[PDB]
Write a protein that binds this ligand. Structure first.
Ligand SMILES: N[C@@H](CCC(=O)N[C@@H](CS)C(=O)NCC(=O)O)C(=O)O
Length: 110
């Protein structure tokens, strides 16, 4: 990715995060992505999925997410504009009772 491509990809990722209470940066056949989506489904939370493998600038987006979050893998979850992390991170928040209130606070759960 060129520096302009990384910049454009970051802007794209930020706009998605800004315009969705819950965002799941994903890949279509990632088992961990499927797990987190299933959890959110069952919690009644609406999310925007973005499948990097189906985006033309998916590599640039993954590079931008690394720069932005230090994370190299999908799923890469944001809630209310804030970085959550991967499947494990989301499961951790579900485990300590913080996830539903976070999801409610930002509108992801009505
Ligand atoms: N501990 C991480 C593991 C996630 C993970 O390993 N994701 C794989 C996809 S199955 C990945 O992103 N591999 C590198 C890639 O596909 O870019 C989590 O719970 O989210």
């Amino acid at each position: 990715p060129t520096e302009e491509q990384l910049k454009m990809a970051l802007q794209k990722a930020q706009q998605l995060v800004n315009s969705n209470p819950l965002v799941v940066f994903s890949k279509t056949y990632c088992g961990y992505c499927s797990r987190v989506k299933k959890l959110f489904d069952q919690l009644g939370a609406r999310y925007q999925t973005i499948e990097l493998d189906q985006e033309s600038d998916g590599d640039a987006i993954q590079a931008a997410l690394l720069q932005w979050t230090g994370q190299r893998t999908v799923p890469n979850v944001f809630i209310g504009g804030k970085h959550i992390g991967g499947c494990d991170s989301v499961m951790e928040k579900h485990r300590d009772g913080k996830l539903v209130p976070m999801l409610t606070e930002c509108g992801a759960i009505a």
